[PDB]
Short mmCIF file of C-alpha atoms and ligand atoms in Angstrom, two decimals:
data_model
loop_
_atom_site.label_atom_id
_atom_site.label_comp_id
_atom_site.label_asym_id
_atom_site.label_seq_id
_atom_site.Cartn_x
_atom_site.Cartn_y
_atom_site.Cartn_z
CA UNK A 1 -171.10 351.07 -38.18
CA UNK A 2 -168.94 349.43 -40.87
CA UNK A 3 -169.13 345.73 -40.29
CA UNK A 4 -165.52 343.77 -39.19
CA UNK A 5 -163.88 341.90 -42.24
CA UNK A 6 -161.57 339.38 -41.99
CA UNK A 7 -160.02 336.63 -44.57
CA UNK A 8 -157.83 333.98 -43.58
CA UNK A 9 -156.34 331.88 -46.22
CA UNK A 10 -152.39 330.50 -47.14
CA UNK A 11 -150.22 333.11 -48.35
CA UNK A 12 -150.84 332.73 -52.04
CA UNK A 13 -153.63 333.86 -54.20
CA UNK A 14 -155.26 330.41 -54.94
CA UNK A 15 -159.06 330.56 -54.05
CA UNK A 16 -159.00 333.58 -52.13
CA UNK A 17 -157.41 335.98 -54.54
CA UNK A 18 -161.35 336.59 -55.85
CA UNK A 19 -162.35 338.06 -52.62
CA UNK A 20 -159.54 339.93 -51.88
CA UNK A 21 -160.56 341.65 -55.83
CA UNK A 22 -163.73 342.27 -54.48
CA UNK A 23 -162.75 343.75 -51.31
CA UNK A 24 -160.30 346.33 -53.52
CA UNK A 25 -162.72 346.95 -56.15
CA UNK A 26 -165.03 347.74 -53.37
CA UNK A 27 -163.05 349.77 -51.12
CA UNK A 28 -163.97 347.76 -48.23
CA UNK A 29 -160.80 347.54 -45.55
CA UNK A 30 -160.41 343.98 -44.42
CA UNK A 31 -157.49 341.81 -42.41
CA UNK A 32 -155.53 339.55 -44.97
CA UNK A 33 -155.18 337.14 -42.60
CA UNK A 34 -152.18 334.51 -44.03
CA UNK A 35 -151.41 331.25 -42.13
CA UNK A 36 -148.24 328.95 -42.70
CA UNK A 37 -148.69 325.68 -44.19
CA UNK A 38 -147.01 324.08 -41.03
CA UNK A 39 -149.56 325.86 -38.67
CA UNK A 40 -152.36 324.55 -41.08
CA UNK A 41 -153.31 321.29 -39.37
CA UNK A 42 -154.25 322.85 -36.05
CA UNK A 43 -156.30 325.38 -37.67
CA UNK A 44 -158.28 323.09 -39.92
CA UNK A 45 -159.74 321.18 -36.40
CA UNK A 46 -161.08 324.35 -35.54
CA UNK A 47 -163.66 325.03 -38.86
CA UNK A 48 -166.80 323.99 -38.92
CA UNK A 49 -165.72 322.49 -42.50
CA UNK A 50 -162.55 322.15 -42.22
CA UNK A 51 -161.33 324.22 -45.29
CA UNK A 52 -160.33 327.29 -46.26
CA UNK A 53 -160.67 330.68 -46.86
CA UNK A 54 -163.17 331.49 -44.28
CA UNK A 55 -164.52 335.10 -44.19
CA UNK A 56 -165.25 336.28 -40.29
CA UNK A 57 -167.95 338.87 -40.66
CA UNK A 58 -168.61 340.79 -36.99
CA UNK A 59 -168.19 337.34 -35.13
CA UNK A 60 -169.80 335.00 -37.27
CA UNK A 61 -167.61 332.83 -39.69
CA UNK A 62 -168.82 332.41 -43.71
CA UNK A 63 -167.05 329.70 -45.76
CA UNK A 64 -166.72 328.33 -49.36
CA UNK A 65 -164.75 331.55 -52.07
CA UNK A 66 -167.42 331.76 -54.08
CA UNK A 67 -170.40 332.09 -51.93
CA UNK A 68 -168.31 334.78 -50.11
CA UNK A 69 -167.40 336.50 -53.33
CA UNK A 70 -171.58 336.58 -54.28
CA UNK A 71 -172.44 337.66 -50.70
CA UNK A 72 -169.86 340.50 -51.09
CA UNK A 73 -170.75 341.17 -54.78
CA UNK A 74 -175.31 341.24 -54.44
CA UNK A 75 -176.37 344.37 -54.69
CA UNK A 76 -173.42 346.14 -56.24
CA UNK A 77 -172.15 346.92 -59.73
CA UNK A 78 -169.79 343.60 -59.57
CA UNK A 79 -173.05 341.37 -59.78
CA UNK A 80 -175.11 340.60 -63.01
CA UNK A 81 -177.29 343.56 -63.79
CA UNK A 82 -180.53 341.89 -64.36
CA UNK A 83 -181.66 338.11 -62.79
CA UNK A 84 -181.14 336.24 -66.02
CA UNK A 85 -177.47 338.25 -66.43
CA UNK A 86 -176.64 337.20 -62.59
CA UNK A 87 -177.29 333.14 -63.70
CA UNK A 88 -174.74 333.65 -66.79
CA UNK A 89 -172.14 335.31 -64.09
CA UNK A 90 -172.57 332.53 -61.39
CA UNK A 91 -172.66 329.56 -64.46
CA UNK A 92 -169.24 331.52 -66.25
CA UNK A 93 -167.90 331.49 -62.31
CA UNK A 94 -168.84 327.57 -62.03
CA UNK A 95 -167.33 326.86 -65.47
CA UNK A 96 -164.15 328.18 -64.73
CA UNK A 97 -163.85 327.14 -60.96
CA UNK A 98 -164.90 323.65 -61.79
CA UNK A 99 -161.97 323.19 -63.89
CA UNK A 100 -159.05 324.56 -61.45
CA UNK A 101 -160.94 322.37 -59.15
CA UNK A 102 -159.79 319.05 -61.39
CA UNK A 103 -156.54 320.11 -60.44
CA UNK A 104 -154.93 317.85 -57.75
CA UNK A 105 -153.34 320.81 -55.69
CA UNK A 106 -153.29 318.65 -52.92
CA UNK A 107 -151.60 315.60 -53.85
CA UNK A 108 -148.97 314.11 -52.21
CA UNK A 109 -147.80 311.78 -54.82
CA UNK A 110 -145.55 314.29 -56.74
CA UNK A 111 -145.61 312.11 -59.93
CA UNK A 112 -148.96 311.46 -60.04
CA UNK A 113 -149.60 315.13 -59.56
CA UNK A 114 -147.19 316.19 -62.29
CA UNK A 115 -149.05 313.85 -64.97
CA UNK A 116 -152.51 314.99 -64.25
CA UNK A 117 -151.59 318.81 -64.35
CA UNK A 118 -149.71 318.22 -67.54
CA UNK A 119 -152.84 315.75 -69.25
CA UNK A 120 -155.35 318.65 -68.11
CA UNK A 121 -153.24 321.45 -69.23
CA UNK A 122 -151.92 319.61 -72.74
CA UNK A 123 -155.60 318.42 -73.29
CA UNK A 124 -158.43 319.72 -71.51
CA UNK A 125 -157.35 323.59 -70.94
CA UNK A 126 -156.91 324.43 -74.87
CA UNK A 127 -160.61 323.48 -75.50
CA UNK A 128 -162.06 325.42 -72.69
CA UNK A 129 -160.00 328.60 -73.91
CA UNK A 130 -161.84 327.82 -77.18
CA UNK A 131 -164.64 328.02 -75.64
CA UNK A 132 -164.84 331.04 -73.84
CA UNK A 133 -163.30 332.86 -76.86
CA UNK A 134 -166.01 332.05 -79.14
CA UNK A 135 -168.39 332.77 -76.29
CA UNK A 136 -166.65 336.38 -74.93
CA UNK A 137 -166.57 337.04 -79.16
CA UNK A 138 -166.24 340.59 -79.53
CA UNK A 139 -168.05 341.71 -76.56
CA UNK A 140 -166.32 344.48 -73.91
CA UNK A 141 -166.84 342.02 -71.11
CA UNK A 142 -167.98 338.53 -70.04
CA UNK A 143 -171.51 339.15 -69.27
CA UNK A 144 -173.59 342.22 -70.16
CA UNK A 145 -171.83 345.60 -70.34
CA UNK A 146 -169.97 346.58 -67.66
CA UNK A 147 -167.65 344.46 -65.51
CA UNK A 148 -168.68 341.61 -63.14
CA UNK A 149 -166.97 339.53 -60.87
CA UNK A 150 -166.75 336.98 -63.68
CA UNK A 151 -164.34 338.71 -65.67
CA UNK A 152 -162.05 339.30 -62.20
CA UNK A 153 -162.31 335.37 -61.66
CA UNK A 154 -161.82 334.93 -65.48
CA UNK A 155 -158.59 336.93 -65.07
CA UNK A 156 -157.20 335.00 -62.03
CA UNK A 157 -158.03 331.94 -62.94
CA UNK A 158 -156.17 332.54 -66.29
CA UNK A 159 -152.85 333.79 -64.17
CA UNK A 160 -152.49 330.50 -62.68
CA UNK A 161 -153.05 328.53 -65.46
CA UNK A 162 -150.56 330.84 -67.16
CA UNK A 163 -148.38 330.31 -64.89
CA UNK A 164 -147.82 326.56 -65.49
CA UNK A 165 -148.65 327.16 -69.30
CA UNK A 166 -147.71 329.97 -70.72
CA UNK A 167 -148.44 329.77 -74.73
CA UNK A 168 -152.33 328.98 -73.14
CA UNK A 169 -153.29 332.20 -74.55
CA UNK A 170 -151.39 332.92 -77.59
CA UNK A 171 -154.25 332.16 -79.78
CA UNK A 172 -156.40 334.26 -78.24
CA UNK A 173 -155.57 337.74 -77.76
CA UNK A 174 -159.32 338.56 -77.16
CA UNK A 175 -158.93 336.66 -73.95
CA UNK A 176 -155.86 338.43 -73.09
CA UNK A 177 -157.38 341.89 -73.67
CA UNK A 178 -160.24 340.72 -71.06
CA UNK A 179 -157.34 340.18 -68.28
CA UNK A 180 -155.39 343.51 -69.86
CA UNK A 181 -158.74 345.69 -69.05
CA UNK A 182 -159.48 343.84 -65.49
CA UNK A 183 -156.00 344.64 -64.60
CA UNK A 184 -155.89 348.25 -65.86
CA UNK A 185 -159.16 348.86 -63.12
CA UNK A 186 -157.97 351.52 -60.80
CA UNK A 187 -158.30 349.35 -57.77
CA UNK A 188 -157.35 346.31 -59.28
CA UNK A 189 -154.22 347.91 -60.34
CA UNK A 190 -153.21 349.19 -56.96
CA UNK A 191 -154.26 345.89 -55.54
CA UNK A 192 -151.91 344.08 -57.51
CA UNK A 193 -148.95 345.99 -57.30
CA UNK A 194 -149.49 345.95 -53.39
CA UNK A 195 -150.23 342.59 -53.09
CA UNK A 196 -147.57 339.95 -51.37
CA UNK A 197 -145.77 338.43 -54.41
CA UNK A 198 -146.57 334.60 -54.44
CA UNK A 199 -146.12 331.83 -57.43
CA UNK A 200 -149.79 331.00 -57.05
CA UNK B 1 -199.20 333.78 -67.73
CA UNK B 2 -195.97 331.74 -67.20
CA UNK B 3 -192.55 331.60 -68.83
CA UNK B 4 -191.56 328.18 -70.53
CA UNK B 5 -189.12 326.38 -69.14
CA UNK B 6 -187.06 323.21 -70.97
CA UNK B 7 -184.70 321.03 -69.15
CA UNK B 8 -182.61 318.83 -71.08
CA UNK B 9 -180.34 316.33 -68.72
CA UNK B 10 -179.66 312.43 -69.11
CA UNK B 11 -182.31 309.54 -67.94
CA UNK B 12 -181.12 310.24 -64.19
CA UNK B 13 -181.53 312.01 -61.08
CA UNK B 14 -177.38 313.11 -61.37
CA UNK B 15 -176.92 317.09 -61.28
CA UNK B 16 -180.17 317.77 -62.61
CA UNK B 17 -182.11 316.51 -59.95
CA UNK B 18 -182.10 319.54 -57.59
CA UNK B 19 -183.97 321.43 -60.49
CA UNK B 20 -186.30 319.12 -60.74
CA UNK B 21 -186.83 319.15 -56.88
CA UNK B 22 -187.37 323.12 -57.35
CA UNK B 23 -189.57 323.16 -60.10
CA UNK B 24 -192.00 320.41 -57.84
CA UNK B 25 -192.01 322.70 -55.07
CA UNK B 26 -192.84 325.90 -56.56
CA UNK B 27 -195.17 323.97 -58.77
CA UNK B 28 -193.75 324.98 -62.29
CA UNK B 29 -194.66 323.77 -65.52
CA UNK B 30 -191.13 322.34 -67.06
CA UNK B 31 -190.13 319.98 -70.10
CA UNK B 32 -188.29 317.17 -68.61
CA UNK B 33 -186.64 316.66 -71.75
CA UNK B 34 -184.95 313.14 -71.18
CA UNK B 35 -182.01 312.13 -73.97
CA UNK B 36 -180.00 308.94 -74.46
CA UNK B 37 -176.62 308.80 -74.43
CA UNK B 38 -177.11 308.29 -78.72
CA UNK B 39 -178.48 311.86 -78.81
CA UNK B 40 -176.08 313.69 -76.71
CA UNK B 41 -173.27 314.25 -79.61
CA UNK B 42 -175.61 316.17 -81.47
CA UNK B 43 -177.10 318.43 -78.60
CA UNK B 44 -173.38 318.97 -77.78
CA UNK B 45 -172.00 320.49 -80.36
CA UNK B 46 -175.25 323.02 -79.61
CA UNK B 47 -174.10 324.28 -76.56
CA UNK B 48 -171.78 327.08 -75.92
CA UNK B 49 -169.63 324.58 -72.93
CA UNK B 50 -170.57 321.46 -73.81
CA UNK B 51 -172.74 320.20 -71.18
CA UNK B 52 -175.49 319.27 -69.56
CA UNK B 53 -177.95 320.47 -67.39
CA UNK B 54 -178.79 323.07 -69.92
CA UNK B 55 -182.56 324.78 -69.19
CA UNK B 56 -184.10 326.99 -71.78
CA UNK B 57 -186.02 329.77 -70.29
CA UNK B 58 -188.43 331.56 -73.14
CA UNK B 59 -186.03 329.94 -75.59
CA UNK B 60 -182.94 331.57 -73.99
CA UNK B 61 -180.29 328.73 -72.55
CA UNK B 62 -178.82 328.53 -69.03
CA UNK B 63 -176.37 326.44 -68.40
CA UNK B 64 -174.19 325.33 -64.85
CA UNK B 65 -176.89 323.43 -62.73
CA UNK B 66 -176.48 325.29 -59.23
CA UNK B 67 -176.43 328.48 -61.51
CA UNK B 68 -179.37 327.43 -62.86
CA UNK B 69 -180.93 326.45 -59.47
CA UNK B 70 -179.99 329.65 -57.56
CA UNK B 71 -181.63 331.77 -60.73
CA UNK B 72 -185.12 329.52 -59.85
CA UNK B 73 -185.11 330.32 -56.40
CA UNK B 74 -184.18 334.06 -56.21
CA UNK B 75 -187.01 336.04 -54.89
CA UNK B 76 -188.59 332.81 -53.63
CA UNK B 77 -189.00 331.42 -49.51
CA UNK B 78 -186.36 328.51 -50.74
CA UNK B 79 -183.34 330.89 -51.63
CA UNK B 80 -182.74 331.89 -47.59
CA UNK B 81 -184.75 334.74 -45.89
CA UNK B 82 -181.22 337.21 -45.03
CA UNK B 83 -178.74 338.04 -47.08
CA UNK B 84 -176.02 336.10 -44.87
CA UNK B 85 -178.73 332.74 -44.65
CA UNK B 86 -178.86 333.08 -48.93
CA UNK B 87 -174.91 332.43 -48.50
CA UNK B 88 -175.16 329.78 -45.93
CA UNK B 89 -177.13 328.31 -48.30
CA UNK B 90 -174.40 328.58 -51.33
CA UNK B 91 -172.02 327.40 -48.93
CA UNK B 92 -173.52 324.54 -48.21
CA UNK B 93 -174.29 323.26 -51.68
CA UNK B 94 -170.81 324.16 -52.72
CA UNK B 95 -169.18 321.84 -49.89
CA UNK B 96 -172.05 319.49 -51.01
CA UNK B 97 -171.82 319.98 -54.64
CA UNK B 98 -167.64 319.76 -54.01
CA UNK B 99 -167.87 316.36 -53.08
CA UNK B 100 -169.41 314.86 -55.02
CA UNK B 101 -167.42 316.74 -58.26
CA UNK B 102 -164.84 314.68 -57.07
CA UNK B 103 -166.30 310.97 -57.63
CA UNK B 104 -164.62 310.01 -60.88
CA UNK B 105 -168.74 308.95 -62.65
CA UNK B 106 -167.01 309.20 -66.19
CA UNK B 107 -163.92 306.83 -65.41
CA UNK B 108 -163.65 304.02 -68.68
CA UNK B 109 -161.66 301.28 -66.58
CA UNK B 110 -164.39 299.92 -63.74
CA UNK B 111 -161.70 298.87 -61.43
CA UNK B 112 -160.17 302.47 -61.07
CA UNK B 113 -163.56 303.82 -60.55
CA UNK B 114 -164.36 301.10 -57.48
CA UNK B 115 -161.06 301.97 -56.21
CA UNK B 116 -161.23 305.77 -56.12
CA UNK B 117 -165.12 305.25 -55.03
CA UNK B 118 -164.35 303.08 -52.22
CA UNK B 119 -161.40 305.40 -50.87
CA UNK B 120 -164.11 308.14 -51.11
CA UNK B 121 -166.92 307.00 -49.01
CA UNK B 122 -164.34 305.09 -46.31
CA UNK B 123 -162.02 307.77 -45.80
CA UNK B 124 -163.49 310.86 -46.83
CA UNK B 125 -166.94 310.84 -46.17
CA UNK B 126 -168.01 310.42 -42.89
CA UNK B 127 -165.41 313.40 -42.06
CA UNK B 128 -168.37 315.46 -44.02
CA UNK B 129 -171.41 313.36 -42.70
CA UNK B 130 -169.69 314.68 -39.58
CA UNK B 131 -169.64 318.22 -40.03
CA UNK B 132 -173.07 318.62 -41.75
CA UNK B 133 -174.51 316.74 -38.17
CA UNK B 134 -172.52 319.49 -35.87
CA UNK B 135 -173.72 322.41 -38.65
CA UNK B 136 -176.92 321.09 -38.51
CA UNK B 137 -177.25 320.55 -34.65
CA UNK B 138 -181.11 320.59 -33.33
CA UNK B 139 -182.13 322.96 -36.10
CA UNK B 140 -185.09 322.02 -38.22
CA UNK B 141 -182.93 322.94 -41.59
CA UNK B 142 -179.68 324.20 -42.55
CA UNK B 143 -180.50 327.13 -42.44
CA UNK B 144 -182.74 329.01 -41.01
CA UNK B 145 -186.10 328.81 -39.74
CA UNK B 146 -187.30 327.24 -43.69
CA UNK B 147 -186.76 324.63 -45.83
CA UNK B 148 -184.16 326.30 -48.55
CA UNK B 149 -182.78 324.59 -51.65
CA UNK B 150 -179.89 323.16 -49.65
CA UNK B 151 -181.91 321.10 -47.80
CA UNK B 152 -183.30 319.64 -51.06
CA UNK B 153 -179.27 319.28 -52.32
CA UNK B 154 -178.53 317.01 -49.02
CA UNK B 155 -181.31 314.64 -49.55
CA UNK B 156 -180.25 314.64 -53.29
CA UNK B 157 -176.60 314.03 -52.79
CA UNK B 158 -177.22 311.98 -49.54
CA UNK B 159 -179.91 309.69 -51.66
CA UNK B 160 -176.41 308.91 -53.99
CA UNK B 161 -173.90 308.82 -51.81
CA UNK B 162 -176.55 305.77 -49.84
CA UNK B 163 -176.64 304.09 -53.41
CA UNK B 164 -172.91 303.54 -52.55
CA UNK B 165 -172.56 303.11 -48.82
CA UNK B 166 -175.87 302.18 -47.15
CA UNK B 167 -174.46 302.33 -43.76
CA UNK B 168 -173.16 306.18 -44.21
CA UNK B 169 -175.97 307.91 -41.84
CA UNK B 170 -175.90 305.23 -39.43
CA UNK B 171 -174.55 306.99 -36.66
CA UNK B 172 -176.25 310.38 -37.88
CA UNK B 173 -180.19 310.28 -37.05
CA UNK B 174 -180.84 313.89 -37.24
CA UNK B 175 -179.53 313.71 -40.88
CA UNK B 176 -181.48 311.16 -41.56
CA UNK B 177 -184.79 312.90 -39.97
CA UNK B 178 -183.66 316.01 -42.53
CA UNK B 179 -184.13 313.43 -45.54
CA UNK B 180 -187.61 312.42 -44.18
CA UNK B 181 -188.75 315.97 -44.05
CA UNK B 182 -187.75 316.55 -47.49
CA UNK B 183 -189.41 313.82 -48.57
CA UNK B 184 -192.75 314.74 -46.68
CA UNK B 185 -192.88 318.01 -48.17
CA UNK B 186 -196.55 317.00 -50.22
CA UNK B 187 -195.15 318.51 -54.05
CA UNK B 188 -191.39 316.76 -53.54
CA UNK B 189 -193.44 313.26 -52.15
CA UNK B 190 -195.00 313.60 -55.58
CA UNK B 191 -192.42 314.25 -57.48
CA UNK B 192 -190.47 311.35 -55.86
CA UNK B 193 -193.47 309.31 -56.53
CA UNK B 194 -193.85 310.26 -59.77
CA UNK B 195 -190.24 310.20 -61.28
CA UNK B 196 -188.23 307.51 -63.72
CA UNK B 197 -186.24 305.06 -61.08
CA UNK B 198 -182.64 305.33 -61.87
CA UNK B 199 -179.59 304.12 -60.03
CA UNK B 200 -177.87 308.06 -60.22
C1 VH4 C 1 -150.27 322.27 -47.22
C2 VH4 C 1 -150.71 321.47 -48.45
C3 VH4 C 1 -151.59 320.30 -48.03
O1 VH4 C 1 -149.52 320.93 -49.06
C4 VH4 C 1 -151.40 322.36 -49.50
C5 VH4 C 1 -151.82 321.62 -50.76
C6 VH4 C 1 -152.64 322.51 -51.69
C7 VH4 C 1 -151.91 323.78 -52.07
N1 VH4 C 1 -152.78 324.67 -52.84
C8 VH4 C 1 -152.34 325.41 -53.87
O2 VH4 C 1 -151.18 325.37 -54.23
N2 VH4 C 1 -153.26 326.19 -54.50
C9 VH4 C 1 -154.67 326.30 -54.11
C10 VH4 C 1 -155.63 326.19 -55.29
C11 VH4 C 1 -155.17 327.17 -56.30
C12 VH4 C 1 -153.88 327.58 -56.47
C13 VH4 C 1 -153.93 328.51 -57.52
N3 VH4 C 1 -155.16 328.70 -57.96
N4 VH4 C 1 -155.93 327.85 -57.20
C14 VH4 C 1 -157.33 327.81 -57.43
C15 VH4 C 1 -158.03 328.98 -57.69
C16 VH4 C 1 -159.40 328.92 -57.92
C17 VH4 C 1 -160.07 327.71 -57.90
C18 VH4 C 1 -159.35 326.58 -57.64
F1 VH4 C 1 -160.00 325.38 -57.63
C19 VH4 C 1 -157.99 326.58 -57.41
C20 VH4 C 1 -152.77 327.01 -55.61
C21 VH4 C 1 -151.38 324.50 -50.83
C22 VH4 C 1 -150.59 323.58 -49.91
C1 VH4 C 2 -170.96 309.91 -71.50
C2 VH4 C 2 -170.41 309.16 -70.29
C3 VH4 C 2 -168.89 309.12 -70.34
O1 VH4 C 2 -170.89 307.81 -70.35
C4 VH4 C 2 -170.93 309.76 -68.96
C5 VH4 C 2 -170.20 309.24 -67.73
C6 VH4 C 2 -170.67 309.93 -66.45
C7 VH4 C 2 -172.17 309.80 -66.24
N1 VH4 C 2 -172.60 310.56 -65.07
C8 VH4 C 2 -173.14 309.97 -63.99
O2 VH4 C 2 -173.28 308.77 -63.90
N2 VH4 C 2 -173.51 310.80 -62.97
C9 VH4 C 2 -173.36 312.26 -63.02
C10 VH4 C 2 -172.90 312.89 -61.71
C11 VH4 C 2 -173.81 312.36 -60.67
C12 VH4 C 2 -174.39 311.13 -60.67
C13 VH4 C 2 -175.16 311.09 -59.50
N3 VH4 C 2 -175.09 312.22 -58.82
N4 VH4 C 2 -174.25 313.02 -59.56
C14 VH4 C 2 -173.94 314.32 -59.08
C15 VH4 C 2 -174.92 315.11 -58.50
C16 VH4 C 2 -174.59 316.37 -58.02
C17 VH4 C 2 -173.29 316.84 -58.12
C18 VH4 C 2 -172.35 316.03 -58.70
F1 VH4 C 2 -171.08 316.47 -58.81
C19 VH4 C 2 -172.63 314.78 -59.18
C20 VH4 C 2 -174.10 310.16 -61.79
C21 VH4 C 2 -172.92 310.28 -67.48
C22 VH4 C 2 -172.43 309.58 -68.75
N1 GSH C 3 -164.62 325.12 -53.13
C1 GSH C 3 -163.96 325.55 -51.92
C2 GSH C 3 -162.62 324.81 -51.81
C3 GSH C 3 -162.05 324.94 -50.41
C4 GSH C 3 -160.67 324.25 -50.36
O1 GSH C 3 -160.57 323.12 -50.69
N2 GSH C 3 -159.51 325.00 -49.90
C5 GSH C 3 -158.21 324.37 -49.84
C6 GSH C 3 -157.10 325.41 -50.01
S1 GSH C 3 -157.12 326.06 -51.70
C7 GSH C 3 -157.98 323.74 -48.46
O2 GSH C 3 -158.69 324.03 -47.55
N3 GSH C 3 -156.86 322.81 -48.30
C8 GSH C 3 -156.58 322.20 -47.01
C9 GSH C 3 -157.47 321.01 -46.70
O3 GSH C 3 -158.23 320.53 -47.59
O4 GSH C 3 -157.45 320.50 -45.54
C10 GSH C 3 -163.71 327.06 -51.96
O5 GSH C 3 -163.66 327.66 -53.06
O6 GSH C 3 -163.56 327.72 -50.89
N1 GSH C 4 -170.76 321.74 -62.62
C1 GSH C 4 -171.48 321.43 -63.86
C2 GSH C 4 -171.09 320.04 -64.36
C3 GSH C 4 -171.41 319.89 -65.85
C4 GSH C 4 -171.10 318.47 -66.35
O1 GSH C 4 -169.97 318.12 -66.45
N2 GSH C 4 -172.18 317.57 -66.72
C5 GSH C 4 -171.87 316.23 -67.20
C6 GSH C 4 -172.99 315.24 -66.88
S1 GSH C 4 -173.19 315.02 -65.09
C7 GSH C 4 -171.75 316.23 -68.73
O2 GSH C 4 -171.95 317.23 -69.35
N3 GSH C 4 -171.42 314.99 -69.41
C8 GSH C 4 -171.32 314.90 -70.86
C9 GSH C 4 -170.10 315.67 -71.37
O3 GSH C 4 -169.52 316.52 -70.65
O4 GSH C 4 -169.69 315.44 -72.53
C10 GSH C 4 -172.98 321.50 -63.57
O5 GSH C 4 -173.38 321.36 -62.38
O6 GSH C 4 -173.80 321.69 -64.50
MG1 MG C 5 -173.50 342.70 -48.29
MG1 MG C 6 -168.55 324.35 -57.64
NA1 NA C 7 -186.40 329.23 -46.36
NA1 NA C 8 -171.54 304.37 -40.42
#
């Protein structure tokens, strides 16, 4: 029968937020599993990695958000339509996820925290929009023509980083059509006005 | 016939190694295009996001170097023989790959690179060395029953991370025997052989 989903993550978006997209997009019925911050550390001992979110699939335990989010996506209309396609959505996927993973989310030096989100977002964040303006260019979506779970990931990366930022975008209202036409997707509009409201 | 394939990387092992690795085993024909830091301005300002591993397949560019990797391997016995094994697989280069993203290699001041190194390797890496020994267990690989691309990454990544902290597998033989079979395998023994010795 239908196989058992179930995500377990904090109660925010964050890394997560991409499968739960997936899982809506798809129609697939899941458990949005949310732990407490304080419960956290006596969770963590019990991963084989230590880290989260963690998708249980029928008793067995997958890890790391984006190698979840491609096992979900192979095989359906999410994923790159040829081979060659697929290697631009994973590399677009890696672009963006390896800079929200510069971030220090996890800091516990507030100061120090402050100045490097500031320096990455003052410096660093403009040039990548650049970048991914001049390479979306007038094209309907990220990659090929339909949509892919790049231009989901594009979309939530681009509401955090909005949310500590948010003239990020004003120069480029290509980008912001992108996240306009991922959020105007049937079931990524129901997802979002059903999900729990959270900052990030 | 045979599609060309161009790699263009620094005079290192660093992220491009793993693509080297696959090329080796599956016996591919590649330009191991080699630049100095002199000519990397130029080639820059070239590239869509700015950096490197790029590979040009039939004159069309990839960038993102486990992107690039996973596109090599697809339909191949290294990319995992299940569906669920092809995402153990991206799990386990992403917790690999996550690691060492966080090494600081383009600090400027030397001392705040030793520092943040040092704090690293003591206090953060065995906790990993850990969990890949309990993943990995008896098994003969990471996953599966096969050598897979993830077992090249860990002899990669574990071949830096020793560069650093000799002693870091001391008190993990199994993943030291995993690093042996790598190296056995006849086309990656050549390649290892055969390549420019760098530090990274
Ligand atoms: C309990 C403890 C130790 O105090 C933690 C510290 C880290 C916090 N963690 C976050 O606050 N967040 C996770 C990362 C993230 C957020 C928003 N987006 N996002 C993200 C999305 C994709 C890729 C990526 F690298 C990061 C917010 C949660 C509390
Ligand atoms: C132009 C400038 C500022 O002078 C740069 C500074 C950083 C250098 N860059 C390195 O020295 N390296 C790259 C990352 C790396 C090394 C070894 N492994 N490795 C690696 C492998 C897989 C994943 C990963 F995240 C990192 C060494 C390249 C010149
Ligand atoms: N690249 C991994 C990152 C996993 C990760 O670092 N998750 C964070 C939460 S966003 C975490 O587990 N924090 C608690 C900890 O590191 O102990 C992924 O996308 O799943
Ligand atoms: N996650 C990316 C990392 C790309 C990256 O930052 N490469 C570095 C070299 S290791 C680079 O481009 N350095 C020169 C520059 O960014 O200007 C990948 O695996 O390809
Ligand atoms: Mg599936
Ligand atoms: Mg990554
Ligand atoms: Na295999
Ligand atoms: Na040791």
């Amino acid at each position: 029968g239908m196989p058992n989903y179930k995500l377990t993550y904090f109660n925010m978006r964050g890394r997560a937020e991409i499968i739960r997209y997936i899982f809506a997009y798809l129609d697939i019925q899941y458990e949005d599993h949310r732990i407490e911050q304080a419960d956290w550390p006596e969770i963590k001992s019990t991963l084989p990695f230590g880290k989260i979110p963690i998708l249980e699939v029928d008793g067995l335990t997958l890890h790391q958000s984006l190698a979840i989010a491609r096992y979900l996506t192979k095989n359906t209309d999410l994923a790159g339509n040829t081979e060659m396609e697929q290697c631009h959505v994973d590399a677009i996927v890696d672009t963006l996820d390896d800079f929200m993973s510069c971030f220090p989310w996890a800091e516990k030096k507030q100061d120090v925290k402050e100045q490097m989100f500031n320096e990455l977002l003052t410096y660093n964040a403009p040039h990548l929009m650049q970048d991914l303006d001049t390479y979306l260019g007038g094209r309907e979506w990220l990659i090929g023509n339909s949509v892919t779970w790049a231009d989901f990931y594009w979309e939530i990366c681009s509401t955090t980083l909005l949310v500590f930022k948010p003239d990020l975008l004003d120069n480029h209202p290509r980008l912001v059509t992108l996240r306009k036409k991922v959020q105007a997707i049937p079931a990524v509009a129901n997802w979002i006005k059903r999900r729990p409201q959270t900052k990030l």
